[PDB]
Design a binder for this molecule. Structure first.
Ligand SMILES: Fc1ccc([P+](c2ccc(F)cc2)(c2ccc(F)cc2)c2ccc(F)cc2)cc1
Lengths: 102, 102
């Protein structure tokens, strides 16, 4: 499967893997995050080799923000109106404006 | 704290070490650059002791669009246009809100 899509997934899944309980979690290796970083950085290296570097990083932030925010709101029941999220919206709107001119 | 700035900075320092260290007669070993990358992930783990994952990500993304812009531009060009100034200012405003959280 495609390197860039794998790289986008690697962070979204990786952070979701880090967000596990202090209790017991099924199927979680304690070396898992360290493996996920090694996998993520290998995928990134392939991604930057074979796609234009500015394009790849602009797409990676762009998809990743929408995907984590939709996943977190939709299936983990999280709030979009909390103080930090309100500041984050301005960053994400500003990021879109620069990306439209790129 | 200085952990979040340090974690972002370690990725930039490691990138700078990687870009500088072309050739193989050079004194510096690739492992030293790997230690700078290992440090960034460890500094992120220190960051996530008292900071939520999304809040840390939003600040990293706010700097990240500037990192994309420097990568896209290389050398600096002429002064920014009105929508670009607004988009950059919205990123500035979001960081100002996030850093004024108690
Ligand atoms: F050109 C680039 C583009 C992206 C990165 P990235 C990244 C890429 C792919 C992935 F699957 C997970 C993380 C990163 C951050 C600290 C490091 F030590 C190594 C990589 C990263 C993480 C969070 C963020 F908000 C922005 C970038 C580095 C250089």
């Amino acid at each position: 499967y495609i390197y860039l899509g794998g790289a986008i997934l690697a962070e979204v899944i990786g952070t979701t893997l880090m967000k596990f309980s202090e209790g017991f979690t099924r199927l979680w290796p304690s070396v898992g995050t360290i493996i996920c970083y090694c996998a993520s950085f290998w995928l990134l290296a392939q991604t930057l080799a074979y796609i234009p570097t500015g394009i790849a990083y602009a797409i990676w932030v762009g998809v990743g923000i929408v995907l984590i925010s939709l996943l977190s709101w939709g299936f983990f029941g999280q709030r979009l109106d909390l103080p930090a999220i309100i500041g984050m919206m301005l960053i994400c709107a500003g990021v879109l404006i620069i990306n439209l001119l790129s």
